Amino acid sequence: MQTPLEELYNVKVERKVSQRRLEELGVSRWSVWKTGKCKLPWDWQVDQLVYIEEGEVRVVPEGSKRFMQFLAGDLVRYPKWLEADLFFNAPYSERYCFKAYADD
């Protein structure tokens, strides 16, 4: 359809995050997750903040024919109750943090 997937699925993105915002979030203390070329299905049970440090991921929501692309330097907030397949085609590295209600 005409509406982008990020708007439909409430995937908040902050492409090209400044270093000041990273330190406000305390990204340097976040855990590290990395992968190579693979496919990851996941259903988010809580909100997750992801800061991509290397590579890119293409996110295909359940039943979708389109994808959302996030690149290194982007800060992504995956919403609670989201079901999607994450696709990687090259080395990928990220720092993540799961957020409960309130929190951040």
Please state, in angstroms and rounded to a whole number, the distance separating the CA atoms of residues 65 and 61: 8
Tell me how far, at minimum, the Cβ of 73 lies from other proteins, in Å: 20
Burial 14-24 (b: 16+ CB within 10 A, else e): eeebeeeeeee
Q: What x/- string results for residues 30 through 69 when contact with other proteins is judged by CB under 8 A?
A: -xxxxxxxxxxxxx-xxxx---------x-xxxxxx-x-x
State yes or no: residue 99 binds other proteins (CB under 8 A).
Answer: yes
Q: Which two tokens mark 46?
A: 């809580």
Binding site for other proteins (CB under 8 A): 1-3, 5, 8-10, 31-43, 45-48, 58, 60-65, 67, 69, 79-81, 83-84, 87-89, 96-103
